[PDB]
Amino acid sequence: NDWWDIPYPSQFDVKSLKTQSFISVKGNKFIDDKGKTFTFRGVNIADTGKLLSRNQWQKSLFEELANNWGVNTIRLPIHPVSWRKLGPDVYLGHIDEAVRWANDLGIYLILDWHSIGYLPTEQYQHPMYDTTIKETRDFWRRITFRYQNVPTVAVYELFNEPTTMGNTLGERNWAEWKTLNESLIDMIYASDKTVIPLVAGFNWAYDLSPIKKAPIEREGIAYAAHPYPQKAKPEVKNDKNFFKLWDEKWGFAADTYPVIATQLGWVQPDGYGAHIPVKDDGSYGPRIVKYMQKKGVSYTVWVFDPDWSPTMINDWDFTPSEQGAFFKQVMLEAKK
Amino acid sequence: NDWWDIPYPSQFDVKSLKTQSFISVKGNKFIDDKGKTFTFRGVNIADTGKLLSRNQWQKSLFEELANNWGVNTIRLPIHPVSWRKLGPDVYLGHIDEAVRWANDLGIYLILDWHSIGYLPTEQYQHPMYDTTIKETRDFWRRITFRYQNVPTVAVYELFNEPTTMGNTLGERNWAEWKTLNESLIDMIYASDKTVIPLVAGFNWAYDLSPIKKAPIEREGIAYAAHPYPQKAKPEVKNDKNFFKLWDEKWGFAADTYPVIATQLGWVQPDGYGAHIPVKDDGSYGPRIVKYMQKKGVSYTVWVFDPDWSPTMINDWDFTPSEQGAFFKQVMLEAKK
Amino acid sequence: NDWWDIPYPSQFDVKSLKTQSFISVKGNKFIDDKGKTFTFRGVNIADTGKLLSRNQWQKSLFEELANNWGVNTIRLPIHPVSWRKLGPDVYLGHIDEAVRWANDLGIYLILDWHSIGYLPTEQYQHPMYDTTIKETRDFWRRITFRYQNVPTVAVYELFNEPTTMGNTLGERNWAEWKTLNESLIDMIYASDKTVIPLVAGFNWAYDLSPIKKAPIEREGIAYAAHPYPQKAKPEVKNDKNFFKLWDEKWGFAADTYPVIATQLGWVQPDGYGAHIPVKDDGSYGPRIVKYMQKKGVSYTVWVFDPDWSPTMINDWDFTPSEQGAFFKQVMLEAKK
Ligand SMILES: OC[C@H]1O[C@@H](O[C@@H]2[C@@H](O)[C@H](O[C@H]3[C@H](O)[C@@H](O)[C@H](O[C@H]4[C@H](O)[C@@H](O)[C@H](O)O[C@@H]4CO)O[C@@H]3CO)O[C@H](CO)[C@H]2O)[C@H](O)[C@@H](O)[C@@H]1O
Ligand SMILES: OC[C@H]1O[C@@H](O[C@@H]2[C@@H](O)[C@H](O[C@H]3[C@H](O)[C@@H](O)[C@H](O[C@H]4[C@H](O)[C@@H](O)[C@H](O)O[C@@H]4CO)O[C@@H]3CO)O[C@H](CO)[C@H]2O)[C@H](O)[C@@H](O)[C@@H]1O
Ligand SMILES: OC[C@H]1O[C@@H](O[C@@H]2[C@@H](O)[C@H](O[C@H]3[C@H](O)[C@@H](O)[C@H](O[C@H]4[C@H](O)[C@@H](O)[C@H](O)O[C@@H]4CO)O[C@@H]3CO)O[C@H](CO)[C@H]2O)[C@H](O)[C@@H](O)[C@@H]1O
Ligand SMILES: [Cl-]
Ligand SMILES: [Cl-]
Ligand SMILES: [Cl-]
Ligand SMILES: [Cl-]
Ligand SMILES: [Cl-]
Ligand SMILES: [Cl-]
Ligand SMILES: [Mg+2]
């Protein structure tokens, strides 16, 4: 009504949660607050607004994943268009639901500001990802305040997929991107020092190689990787050659910092919603899992949804897709 | 209708005003155009839009202040949300009213772009204060053009209360803020060299100390200070200790440049709309007045409104509040 | 409907066009792809949205110009307010029409992002020109993608008229403007290397003199000039004195780079829609044409419209205005 009476914001009520360990960074590993090494293992679900539109934003979704798919983590890809469409207040109210659901089940959330493009020039792959530096800062300001001292919310993934699309969106420049990530980290750490910022490299969060010489100059962070099957292109398709290429671009990072592969997965080239870079004959599955397990790398498969591809499920009865069936058994075995 | 026919803007008609002295900066003082030392002494009123909503935007308001409260100055806190809500054209049309009313009564206006936060990152304490560098420049561009050669409009207070809220809004950086103020000053001086820009420091316009080594590198400006009672926190509460702390952070500035305390005031801790940093037992009143009178510091008390706190009045019949009664007698005595 | 289903954009179908030479830059000249020196000679028409509003956006308009006025070029001044009003999708669909019409007639288009002001501070002469760096980049991103490999679209005129209006809009700074143009060029060249970027100087695209020491550091570009009659102000009004002043500020550029005078023209001081800087007794016409022909300078007269001034026509039956009659004969003679 009267703009001067608009309330100041409130923080999530931590008393509403059951006891749950905080996850933290220690050297190249995540650890829980009992000191035990921890690996994020789980899935993406679709944007909250997408799920709400078909009445699929429900605790039953989290229960299925925790109880039947072996997950300890769900990644929420918050699309800026949806953040605007629902509005911050309403969107945050739904994130609160996810927090309570995850907490009840003893699982963790990665909050992902889900854009694709080059934030320093504010140019993007598609309008669903459109944002500004101002809006991006404000999202992280609001999130960090609201979820202060909440162990369930473990990771703040600052910007899903940095890319300039062959420099059509701007001139990719590591120093500039590094500085902007450091700026976001500083805002976050000023508000909550317990959360783990997750930083991505260029080429759609595939190339971490700039961190060899110029890593982000902040402690307690982890690095993202999106090792989709068609990103590495060896002439001879075997474990050794893929492993070497992955090592060069992103895997080396796990020697020094924790790494979360926050997107990975495949569909057959003639399968549902097939597109570059997610097409594969299936051999990628065992290979990427072997690689990640060798390096202790964390992961959230894309995507546990029957509409968005590559799918893990064929329907809302959770009939597994090819990749779904594969990762389900991997996660169930890892949980044991 | 057709965007190509939208008129270019017009300037305030100076022929509509009665003769009134221009106020200017000379060394550490303000002077009128007869050469006599001048002190701004007055009050804030509420945002124009707030007053309009209850039909309280009236000349009778200015008349009460000039005739009965001893003021020579009114500060208008133009909130960006209200600037947008009324629209520039309509808001400026109401500022024109204030100009004619003030001019008729021989009093002056401070125009305050009333935001709280960190403009370089475009992050703010509350959405009522939300703005951008672009909108802020445009506000000053429009204001400076419209009120060219108008003596009644004396001071352009560029940004009410700079703060990063413990670096949650961004990393406070004096060089960056100094440069941005210099940029705004350059736009203003390109359009009207007679106006006085008023520059604020960090910690909600409390800390001017960076100007000891790095003052804004422009002539004819003054500095703002917001010495609310709870800003200085001496262990022993007496004149000497408060004076020393005020000296350290803002009072020293008055030795070299003119200073306007554009917000100050108090309410009892159990009084109406009490909040940090405006709570005091009342002893602050005599103390801040003694301090300002000693240093020749100008001031506008916050706020001459019965709804917005700390109030100077309890109702629209102008029943004085505690601080209202106090400052009313101070201003009346100073006017004599 | 559902934002995740919003289509990715498509490119203009080059198979829809008849064969037409590409125009390119070679040293200080334009050449066609047969190697012959080429001069752009033509007119501006009004903004597409302006023409649509009165049902004047028609192929008949292009046919009149190509068949009866001797043009080989039409400049389209795309106003940001109109880009927003129609929306990118609809505006681009109308530009597609112009492409097909021009191509059919064997003539070329200059696409002009038609703003006036200082892009680095995002401050402008009038709201019809209002834009941001983000919107400007996005316009060029969309344009370059859509018209890839289209010979008909020859020139991308990045920003119509740079000016700070006496530094009221910001502090003019060549290094800053040069860098921003280079940034836009890099985005464009990443998407289509065949197009010709057209760069403007300060003082409403009049002053190219900064390029003597600090030219844009990219190949294949041309420079704009807007030599309106009142821009040069010799005390003695003859060819020699105007030529010298034009030489100093913009004409020298044609010695080293190709130049397009993308706005020029006049109306009598007591004529229709007369204003600075377009007022002249008519002697300017022969003088500017003589000057341009001497230097091999390309041009598009402002403006072939009966409402927008200075006009080339008095009505939609194409009754020529004074300047219209003059330039019509110049262009017809040049075409022969
Ligand atoms: O396009 C060629 C280039 O592709 C590059 O890979 C991109 C890839 O990283 C990206 O991965 C994710 C997106 O992050 C995610 O948003 C998207 O979700 C879609 C979903 O696929 C649709 O079914 C649904 O309707 O809408 C959602 C919207 O979020 O899922 C993909 C993984 O499938 O996807 C984009 C295209 O969407 C890829 O462009 C690659 O890195 C380059 O090498 C390549 O040139
Ligand atoms: O919040 C803790 C921190 O407070 C810091 O002080 C801030 C103070 O400087 C600021 O002063 C003014 C505002 O500038 C002014 O906008 C506000 O007006 C309110 C009014 O109080 C309400 O009654 C009304 O409904 O809405 C108007 C909107 O303009 O009045 C205050 C003075 O009372 O106020 C803010 C809070 O509003 C303070 O945060 C302090 O500097 C820090 O040390 C402290 O940590
Ligand atoms: O104003 C004083 C200053 O004028 C400066 O010249 C400007 C001049 O370059 C500019 O040229 C073009 C504009 O680019 C173009 O947009 C405008 O179109 C108008 C048209 O004139 C109207 O009839 C119509 O209704 O609306 C369109 C909107 O696009 O046409 C002019 C040429 O006539 O025009 C502006 C004013 O419109 C000039 O300010 C000059 O360079 C300075 O020296 C001078 O101080
Ligand atoms: Cl990239
Ligand atoms: Cl594909
Ligand atoms: Cl601060
Ligand atoms: Cl309080
Ligand atoms: Cl200029
Ligand atoms: Cl004029
Ligand atoms: Mg947390």
Ligand SMILES: [Mg+2]
């Ligand atoms: Mg004035």
Ligand SMILES: [Mg+2]
């Ligand atoms: Mg082309």
